[PDB]
Amino acid sequence: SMEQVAMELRLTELTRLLRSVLDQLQDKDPARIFAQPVSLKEVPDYLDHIKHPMDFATMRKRLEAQGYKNLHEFEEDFDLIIDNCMKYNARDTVFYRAAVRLRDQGGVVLRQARREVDSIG
Q1: Which one of 3, 7, 85, 93 is separated from 69 by 20 to 30 angstroms, measured CA to CA?
Q2: Where does the UniProt annotation locate this protein?
């Protein structure tokens, strides 16, 4: 149907916008602390602590499968990165501190992407 096509084109454009958002968020993590999943070889007990792991590579796979239906779903995954880190790691660690900075600096990027998604429909 012509309707399924137009829907598909909207999803493609949402994907294009979220890709740019993701690149901007990932630049706020220059140390690459959140680039890849926490290694279960190196932290064998991680899943006893964190029930829903998340990282920027796993978000990127989901993105390119057009697996995000809206900005809210994307933000949920971004928030998991930060919130998992802040529970697993103590306050006085390079890891926790990096999460706090990513959170604070991402807020600006997400503030405007919420307006661009409402604006462009």
Answers
A1: 85
A2: Nucleus; Chromosome
DSSP string, 20-75: HHHHHHHHT-TT-SSSSPPPTTTSTTHHHH-SS---HHHHHHHHHTT--SSHHHHH
Give the method used.
Answer: X-ray
Residue whose token pair is 């064998």 = 44
The one-letter amino acid at 106: G
Q: How far apart are CA 101 and CA 81, in angstroms?
A: 12
Tokens of 88: 């697993």
Q: How far apart (Å, rounded) are the C-alpha atoms in residues 42 and 39?
A: 5
What's the resolution in A? 1.9
Q: Which two tokens stand for residue 107?
A: 């807020």
**Residue 64 is which amino acid?**
E
Here the tokens at position 33 are: 């602390």
